[PDB]
Amino acid sequence: GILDIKNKVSNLFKKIKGEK
């Protein structure tokens, strides 16, 4: 995947931010 990796961390983003 290309923007794949980006999109993946896009996901991590909300998770890391959400669980704090």
| Single-letter residue type at 14 | K
Alpha carbons within 13 angstroms on the beta-carbon side of residue 17 total 6
Tokens of 8: 């993946």
Experimental method: NMR
6 vs 4: CA distance, rounded Å: 5
Alpha carbons within 13 angstroms on the beta-carbon side of residue 2 total 0
Residue given tokens 């931010």 in the structure block:
17
Tokens of 9: 């961390």
Alpha helix ranges (H) inside 1-20: 4-18
